Each structure stands twice: as C-alpha cells, then as structure tokens.
Write an enzyme that holds these catalytic residues in place. Structure first.
Site, PDB file in Angstrom:
ATOM      1  CE  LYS A 159     -17.802  -1.694  -4.764  1.00  0.00           C
ATOM      2  NZ  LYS A 159     -18.622  -2.672  -5.525  1.00  0.00           N
TER       3      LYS A 159
ATOM      4  CG  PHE B 108     -27.711   9.481  -3.692  1.00  0.00           C
ATOM      5  CD1 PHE B 108     -26.863   8.874  -2.782  1.00  0.00           C
ATOM      6  CD2 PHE B 108     -29.006   9.765  -3.297  1.00  0.00           C
ATOM      7  CE1 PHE B 108     -27.283   8.607  -1.487  1.00  0.00           C
ATOM      8  CE2 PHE B 108     -29.431   9.490  -2.007  1.00  0.00           C
ATOM      9  CZ  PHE B 108     -28.575   8.903  -1.105  1.00  0.00           C
TER      10      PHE B 108
ATOM     11  CG  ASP C 141     -23.480 -10.291  -2.355  1.00  0.00           C
ATOM     12  OD1 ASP C 141     -24.125 -10.947  -1.546  1.00  0.00           O
ATOM     13  OD2 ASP C 141     -22.644  -9.471  -2.033  1.00  0.00           O
TER      14      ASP C 141
ATOM     15  CB  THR D 142     -18.509  -7.222  -5.356  1.00  0.00           C
ATOM     16  OG1 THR D 142     -18.486  -5.845  -4.931  1.00  0.00           O
ATOM     17  CG2 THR D 142     -17.229  -7.894  -4.890  1.00  0.00           C
TER      18      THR D 142
HETATM   19  C1  LIG Z   1     -21.324  -1.353  -3.135  1.00  0.00           C
HETATM   20  N1  LIG Z   1     -21.983  -0.294  -3.887  1.00  0.00           N
HETATM   21  C2  LIG Z   1     -22.732   0.705  -3.400  1.00  0.00           C
HETATM   22  C3  LIG Z   1     -23.099   1.486  -4.472  1.00  0.00           C
HETATM   23  C4  LIG Z   1     -23.975   2.580  -4.437  1.00  0.00           C
HETATM   24  C5  LIG Z   1     -24.371   3.315  -5.535  1.00  0.00           C
HETATM   25  C6  LIG Z   1     -25.235   4.342  -5.389  1.00  0.00           C
HETATM   26  N2  LIG Z   1     -25.697   4.572  -4.149  1.00  0.00           N
HETATM   27  N3  LIG Z   1     -26.591   5.472  -3.838  1.00  0.00           N
HETATM   28  C7  LIG Z   1     -26.815   5.260  -2.536  1.00  0.00           C
HETATM   29  C8  LIG Z   1     -26.044   4.213  -2.022  1.00  0.00           C
HETATM   30  C9  LIG Z   1     -26.046   3.607  -0.673  1.00  0.00           C
HETATM   31  C10 LIG Z   1     -25.169   2.557  -0.376  1.00  0.00           C
HETATM   32  C11 LIG Z   1     -25.253   1.944   0.860  1.00  0.00           C
HETATM   33  N4  LIG Z   1     -26.130   2.310   1.808  1.00  0.00           N
HETATM   34  C12 LIG Z   1     -26.962   3.336   1.523  1.00  0.00           C
HETATM   35  C13 LIG Z   1     -26.956   4.013   0.312  1.00  0.00           C
HETATM   36  C14 LIG Z   1     -25.296   3.815  -3.103  1.00  0.00           C
HETATM   37  N5  LIG Z   1     -24.434   2.829  -3.207  1.00  0.00           N
HETATM   38  C15 LIG Z   1     -22.499   0.870  -5.576  1.00  0.00           C
HETATM   39  N6  LIG Z   1     -21.820  -0.207  -5.229  1.00  0.00           N
END
Ligand SMILES: Cn1cc(-c2cc[n+]3[nH]cc(-c4ccncc4)c3n2)cn1
Ligand code: NA
Ligand code: NI
Length: 328
Positions: free
Chosen positions: A41, A137, A179, A219
């Site tokens: 991110k 992940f 959220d 967030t």
């Molecule tokens: C805003 N945000 C997203 C994450 C995060 C942390 C870990 N994963 N692992 C998969 C996704 C993901 C995010 C979106 N759409 C699909 C998969 C994913 N996203 C952490 N903060």
C-alpha cells in the site's frame, strides 16, 4: 532519512507488481518478495498537490494508521487476546522519488480492465515522499467473491470470523474499524477445518468452511492503549457523510450519529453497524454455488436473517460474539 523506491521495490519485485486495489489514500499492488506473495500500500505524504480529490496527509497524520496496522498484526502472536483475523504487517518505509514507470504501467493495466476513480499518479516529483506498507497477502475481497462462495454456511463462517476478530480487538485495544465495507474483507483458502481465537484468555473455535478471513485497511480505524487514543479525525470531513446508492454510505452517517461527531471516543457500536452492513450484503448482493433448498441450509438462512434483524440491539462485537444465538 527516506529510502529510494528501489529499496522497497528492486527490479524483479517491481516487474511482478500488479495493481489489486485503490482508494483516496493511494494504491495497492500485489507482488512476490522472497518467493512469498505480499500486498503493498503506497500513500503519498507531505506534498502540496491534490491526490484523488484530497490534500496529502503529513507524516503525523499518517502515523495513526501505521500504529494501528502494527497493533492488529501483533494479535496473531498474542495469547490472552489472539486472532489471525486481521492482516500481517511486514514492514513500513518512508520512500522518496517519482512514481516508478513499472508501477504506472500496472496502474494503467488496472484502469484499462477495471477502471479507476483515482488520478494517474504520474505527477509526483523526485522529491516526493510516500509511506509504503508491506502486508501479508490476505486473499481476494468479499465483493469480488459475491458469486463464488459455496453456501450460506460459508457466509455464517465469515460472519463468525469477523465478529470474533473484532471482539478480540475490542477487548485488547478498544478497536473500531470504522470502514469495514466488503472490499476490506479478504478470503483465502485454508485446509484447517477449525480456526482458533482467544478472548480474554478463553479460547474457542470457528468452523472455517475452508476459508480464513482477513480484515484490512485501517485508514479510518481507532484504538487506544494505556489511555492514549490513536484515530483518524473525520469530524470536519464533508463528503464522507454525503454518499448514497449503498447502505455503506448510511453507515458513515449512523457512526456520526452514534458518536456525536466525536471520533476520539470509543463507540464499539460502530463495529456492530459494519457487521450489519456485511450481513445485509450476504443476504442481498451475494449468490451461492449451493442454494438453500435443503432443511439444514434453510435453518442457517433463518439464523442469519434473525441475526440481521436483531444484531443492532447489541452494543459491540464482543456482545454479539458472547451473546447472539447465531454463534451458539
Ligand atoms: C487498503 N489496504 C489493502 C490492504 C491489503 C493487504 C493485504 N492484501 N492481500 C490482498 C489484498 C487485496 C486488496 C484489494 N483487493 C484485493 C486484494 C490486500 N490488501 C491493506 N490495506
Ligand atoms: Na489474517
Ligand atoms: Ni528496509
């Protein structure tokens, strides 16, 4: 001082980046680090340019979310209040530079295939600062899985898992997500039949139905430790409370009603509202490989409908977990 993008994203890692998500905050990419899937991110900070309709946060303003991510990640290794139902945080860096061309190419590909609500992040100069959070992940979000879940038994497992995770964070950290729309619920396959959590030293289990849930995106979240409160102050935000076309947008207004626009206070009822929003999505905007045309599956549906219509009379996720009939 800050590091270059190449510290966090050397060439091979960068060439495997694919955009998977976005928000006003910035961009989320998936890649491979040391043969392991991660999610990255990237938030612009400290600059004067408008990004996705908003001014950039300062370092001080982004620190809450960093702290919260760290605390929720630790809950997987705790004992008295333990849950794997958030997401692991691997690292945080402050990065300086312009946006890597390879990330812009992955951004462009996402825009072509899914469409973006964000500005193409190509206007940042080589002195621009960013925070880069690298996460475990967590799988695929619930929204993208609307038509892929097996049955309402899965839906029940998801709700139990979410409720237990939130309760454990309430107990340990006086946590509110604030959220928890269905993009922020991740699912990943697991061969474990039973998942374990511990709440104030009492351990219990949840049938997995072959999935493990991870709650993401802190967030707007809030928590406290030792009387020090960490949160996103949205009391002067206009647009957050003016959305429509989805119950999601009512939740923001019902949160503001519950807390009298005082976002530092603890109102775990906000967790209940998000759970209600999520139960609603399962009952209305999702479809299952197996329908509810057997008696056993019918009783599950009745129980989730009963949860939908009674849960808003509970004061917290803890209250739901410990007392609602759905989880007995
Ligand atoms: C805003 N945000 C997203 C994450 C995060 C942390 C870990 N994963 N692992 C998969 C996704 C993901 C995010 C979106 N759409 C699909 C998969 C994913 N996203 C952490 N903060
Ligand atoms: Na998790
Ligand atoms: Ni480093």
């Amino acid at each position: 001082g800050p590091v270059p993008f190449s510290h966090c994203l050397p060439t091979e890692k960068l060439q495997r980046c694919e955009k998977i998500g976005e928000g006003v905050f910035g961009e989320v990419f998936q890649t491979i680090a040391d043969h392991t899937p991660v999610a990255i991110k990237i938030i612009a900070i400290e600059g004067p340019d408008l990004v996705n309709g908003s001014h950039q946060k300062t370092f001080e303003e982004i620190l809450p979310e960093i702290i919260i991510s760290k605390e929720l990640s630790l809950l997987s290794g705790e004992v008295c209040n333990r849950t794997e139902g958030f997401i692991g945080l691997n690292s945080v860096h402050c990065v300086q530079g312009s946006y890597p061309p390879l990330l812009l190419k992955a951004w462009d590909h996402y825009n072509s295939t899914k469409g973006s609500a964000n500005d193409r992040p190509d206007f940042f100069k080589d002195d621009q600062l960013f925070i880069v959070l690298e996460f475990e992940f967590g799988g695929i979000d619930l929204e993208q899985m609307r038509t892929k879940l097996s049955s309402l038994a899965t839906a029940k497992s998801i709700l139990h898992q979410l409720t237990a995770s939130l309760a454990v964070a309430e107990a340990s950290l006086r946590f509110e997500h604030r959220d928890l729309h269905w993009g922020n619920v991740l699912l990943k396959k697991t061969s474990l039949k039973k998942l374990h959590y511990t709440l104030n030293g009492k351990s219990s289990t949840i049938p997995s139905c072959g999935l493990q849930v991870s709650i993401i995106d802190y967030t707007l979240s809030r928590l406290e430790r030792d009387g020090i409160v960490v949160f996103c102050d949205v009391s002067m935000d206009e647009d957050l409370f003016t959305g429509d076309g989805d119950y999601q947008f009512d939740i923001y207004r019902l949160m503001k009603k519950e807390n009298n626009n005082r976002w530092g206070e603890y109102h775990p009822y906000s967790n209940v509202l998000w759970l209600h929003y999520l139960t609603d999505k399962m009952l209305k905007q999702m479809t299952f490989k197996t329908k509810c045309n057997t008696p056993a599956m019918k009783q599950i549906k009745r129980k989730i409908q009963e949860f939908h219509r009674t849960m808003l009379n509970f004061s917290s996720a803890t209250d739901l977990l410990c007392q609602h009939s759905l989880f007995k």
